[PDB]
């Protein structure tokens with residue numbers, strides 16, 4: 471039996487992609503960069519804050535100092551944070567609160583393995599903090615594309631190996647990260663996106679304890 475579930479945040483617990491998009495678009499427009507549209511935001515799925523900014527600058531072949539780069543990232547984050555101030559418990563994705571309750575009821579550890587430094591704030595806004603035995607801090611581990619480090623950190627923060635854990639993710643890069651950690655991925659979304667040889671559910675209403683248990687047993691030799 472798995473000992474922990476490692477939760478992604480965006481696309482699993484809730485999704486703030488619309489606010490990330492609007493904050494990036496506002497930053498781009500402020501510096502005279504056109505072309506940050508909704509489809510462009512698709513290109514940022516599984517992409518870090520810094521790598522996202524770099525893609526936007528690349529749109530306009532815009533060159534900046536390392537220091538200016540840091541300031542631009544901070545600017546976007548400030549705007550993003552303003553926008554997520556209105557997140558509430560009503561923004562919790564379907565099935566997620568019940569899953570957290572069922573995991574807690576069965577003494578299965580719950581860890582956050584979000585790439586976002588805004589994870590703790592978002593859990594507080596959703597009244598979910600106390601369900602989480604640990605929050606892995608993305609500032610303290612690798613943020614490169616598909617890096618397993620956040621999932622490894624999340625498992626370790628609740629006293630388990632990734633091999634004893636399930637990881638939930640909405641992005642191709644995050645699924646890859648989970649695989650590389652040694653945890654068992656269960657993706658939410660479309661296979662065309664998430665990849666092959668994993669269990670994929672179409673929406674979070676399918677993330678039930680019963681289903682996670684069935685999948686675990688299917689994937690054990």
Ligand SMILES: O=P(O)(O)OC[C@H]1O[C@](O)(COP(=O)(O)O)[C@@H](O)[C@@H]1O
Pocket residue numbers: 478479480481490514516517518519522547583584585586587588589
């Ligand atoms: O891994 P999650 O919870 O889906 O969060 C993904 C988000 O994390 C980031 O990589 C970093 O988020 P922050 O800018 O809030 O620190 C975003 O670019 C991305 O949209």
Ligand SMILES: [Mg+2]
Pocket residue numbers: 478479480481482639640641644
């Ligand atoms: Mg996500």
Ligand SMILES: [Mg+2]
Pocket residue numbers: 478479480583584585639641644
């Ligand atoms: Mg993630």
Ligand SMILES: [Mg+2]
Pocket residue numbers: none
């Ligand atoms: Mg269904």
